[PDB]
Prior knowledge:
Blueprint: H1 3-9, H2 23-36, E1 56-58, E2 75-77, H3 80-97, E3 119-120, H4 125-137, E4 147-148, H5 172-189, H6 191-200, H7 204-218, E5 221-226, H8 233-246, E6 254-259, H9 262-275, E7 284-288, E8 291-293, E9 300-305, H10 306-312, E10 317-318, E11 322-326, H11 333-348, E12 353-358, H12 363-369, E13 375-378, E14 386-388, H13 390-397, H14 403-408, H15 425-433, H16 441-454, E15 459-463, H17 467-479, E16 489-494, H18 500-504, E17 515-520, E18 533-538, E19 541-548, E20 553-560, H19 563-571, E21 580-583, H20 587-592, H21 607-616, H22 621-626, H23 634-646, H24 658-664, H25 670-681, H26 685-693, H27 715-718, H28 725-742, H29 744-754, H30 758-778, H31 799-811, E22 816-821, E23 824-827, E24 831-835, E25 853-855, E26 858-860, E27 866-868, E28 871-872, H32 875-881, E29 886-888, E30 894-896, E31 900-903, H33 906-913, H34 915-928, H35 938-950
Parallel strand pairs: 3-31, 4-10, 5-12, 5-13, 6-9, 6-11, 7-9, 11-12, 14-21, 15-17, 15-18, 16-17, 18-21, 24-27
Antiparallel strand pairs: 1-2, 7-8, 19-20, 22-23, 22-25, 23-24, 25-28, 26-27, 29-30, 30-31
The structure holds one RNA strand of 9 nucleotides.
Enzyme class: hydrolase
GO biological process, one term: chromatin organization
Protein name: Dosage compensation regulator mle
Amino acid sequence: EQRDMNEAEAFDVNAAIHGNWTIENAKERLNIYKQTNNIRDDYKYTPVGPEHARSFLAELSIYVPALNRTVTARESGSNKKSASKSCALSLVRQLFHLNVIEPFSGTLKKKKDEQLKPYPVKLSPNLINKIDEVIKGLDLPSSVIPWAPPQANWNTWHACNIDEGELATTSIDDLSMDYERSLRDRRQNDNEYRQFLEFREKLPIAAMRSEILTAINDNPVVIIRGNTGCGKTTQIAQYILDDYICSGQGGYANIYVTQPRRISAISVAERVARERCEQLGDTVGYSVRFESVFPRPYGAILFCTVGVLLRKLEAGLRGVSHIIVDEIHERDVNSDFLLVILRDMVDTYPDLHVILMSATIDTTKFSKYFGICPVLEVPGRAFPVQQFFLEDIIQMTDFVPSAESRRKRKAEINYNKVCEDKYSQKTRNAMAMLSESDVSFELLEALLMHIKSKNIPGAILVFLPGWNLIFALMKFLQNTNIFGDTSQYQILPCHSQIPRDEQRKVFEPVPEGVTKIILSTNIAETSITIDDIVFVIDICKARMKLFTSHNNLTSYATVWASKTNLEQRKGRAGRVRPGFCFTLCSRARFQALEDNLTPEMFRTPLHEMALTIKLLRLGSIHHFLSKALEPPPVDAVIEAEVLLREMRCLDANDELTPLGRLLARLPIEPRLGKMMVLGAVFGCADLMAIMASYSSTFSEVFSLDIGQRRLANHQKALSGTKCSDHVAMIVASQMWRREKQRGEHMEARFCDWKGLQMSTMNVIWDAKQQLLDLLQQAGFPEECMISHEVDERIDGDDPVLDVSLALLCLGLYPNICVHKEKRKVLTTESKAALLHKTSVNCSNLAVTFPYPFFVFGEKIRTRAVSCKQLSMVSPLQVILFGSRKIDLAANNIVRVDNWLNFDIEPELAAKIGALKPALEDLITVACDNPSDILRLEEPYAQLVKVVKDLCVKSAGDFGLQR
RNA sequence: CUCUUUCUU
Length: 962
Ligand SMILES: Nc1ncnc2c1ncn2[C@@H]1O[C@H](COP(=O)(O)OP(=O)(O)O)[C@@H](O)[C@H]1O
Ligand SMILES: [Mg+2]
């Protein structure tokens, strides 16, 4: 079977920009190039995707001697074959971009067939003549980011004049003297602070302390490398601040600190606040999304995630004295972005000091990055830890694989059967029987039971790939007789999309006689510290998001963690007392793990980050990314540039239009930002914002019970006769708002009854409120964002909701599909796909829907391309908002996006299609004058009126029985 | 058949 998967994966969307290079000729061209340049390199099919979903992966690595670069690729696949095709296409496109191969120009082929039957659409005479009048009316057919030392009457964090309080005649010198006197008095009198310094002097970092300061005082860029638990993050900023205060210059110090994760930043800020024996928000503050406590403008340490600093960079960095980047080894997009921006900072302004601190980096690489900068190694760690591997526990608890899986069970190197002959025979058989991709719950239960038998107090930490395995393990352990006793063991998950209360529950102490088992993803990997952690159990798997750009496919892959991730998870233990680190993989597998995971820049879209580049005015995108540490593939850069230019956020000169600036200021996908602005023009910004926020969450609203492959009848009614996920999400959020407003326990019981997710609703509402606030900041009047109650039970027409569903087509372009029966739909160019089990439109019967056109939010690959966040849309909405060009096919059939066929009058088709440039002009004029969107010239008011009349559900149901 | 790595004043 599964020819449909090959047909769907061969699909291409952006072959036009890359010189007509597609899958069908990419492998041939790559083979020809390799033969010509006598390159003997070959694919590295890296099997992944566990075993119930044996996907694969692939990665060539051709080397271009002439230019001296090394053009490389990394792609996903559902069977070696397809991946290799995608990798070859990426490599060929990249090699084309630096002009080493001529653009393709000959011929491909056409199989089409299966052409879909036309869908008749008719419009009422009043609608047509209104469109005619509307058409007649609308006459239709670089600089340097600045820096400055701290100044009087200026706030560093807010970058605004104070003009308030009694801090007007207070100079910097007087403030520094007051700070020095206060610090001396605190040191002399308070005994808790003195005890804290007595503890701090015992840390290894103290032995290096003095010389570290010298480096900071002699070189703008300093790299610090040391073992985990040696006290870098909570000590370096304090050392700098205390030196500045004691040296009579306490008012001239401002030390930013950047943490890779929210919980890490919060925990480190709290620990710094406790170490100075002071309340939060006075000297040390933190600023993460949806939670910010700010310290005094002078002599303060601010902990913020990298994205927060990137958003702060728009206002400039006037008044900062030091910037610290922790966990630089993360290699993600924001870290490298901040690295380039900080290099520019140091080069332009030598007074600013930048300190890079981490535990496991290539010191030579980052030193040569900054044009040779000092690197200081901190020797020694806090306490030693004992490390074990899978075969060690197998010998060390006499575990035997269950007969259960022994038969339930029923050339890639399987390291689980390779081990030293020092160990016993039965241990070797037990190690060999276990598979690699899957995990064993019997193994974990036996290991935890033996740890209990060890009678060593302390928390247990289990690192897991994702939510599914975490909650499956929670359910499995809860059913056990021993671990089900809440008085003996307490199990806490640690996930970013879990409620914030549960995230903070991982730091609070537990009562006597109970052991805390924390099941975490890689959120608990870096820089956090829990006092009672003694045991770290590493499953050695990490999940990443693979994005195939040529077919616009997304997937989640559970791949083996690198050695750096394992070393950091090991370092999470043994910070206050010696412990154990049980790592679950063979010693051969441990030796076979990659050094570091691939950086995010090589496997992520760059449209948002290129837009941010243009916002802060660093210059051309291509040159800026050529200045980056690890240059992203040129094809991704050109795809981002074309995506922004085509959507009109950049003019012909690659400059920033006001729409581009406004979309840059929003924390949303640029397409979602344009869609939100259009929703604001039509006076439906509340629903528009909440719906856009649900389309950038990667979380689920409805929680199908473990296994059930459909929602049910409580949840599948929220959607109501609309048969759309977004209307159901709106109804659920509207009910949940009232339920919370009447009680928090009411919120919990409502979420239990209706089968929702409390954390998903909270994050969606918070993102929607932030979007509304930012839209208000730009000048859009509040009258455009009044909350509109949605009645999903009403069938027929609803202007606001229908125009919202129509604007979805513009916001989720080109994610459109056509349903046939049961769960089978066709995506663009008629590629077969399945409706996901979570979506409310999934059905086991051969039921039919009124309008067979859908727009979905995500296209996830599994063992069958699946779709996510579906919503039904009328043909008129699709024609208006879901295509760029509309043409005329044979026998008078209108063709949309070269794959949709409509039976509609060509004259009226041209009439309706002429409105899209008018809509672009409306967006431009609305973003130009945000305060003047609700009042407009008469032609644009008529345009809005006819668009509202066209976006009705039954606007094209005249004379049709349907 | 596995709905949910991290981040965005
Ligand atoms: N909750 C806590 N209880 C006791 N000690 C702590 C706690 N949090 C942090 N510490 C101590 O503070 C130090 C901070 O180390 P840190 O600089 O975060 O390590 P790294 O340099 O790897 O980030 C650690 O050595 C740890 O012993
Ligand atoms: Mg290394």
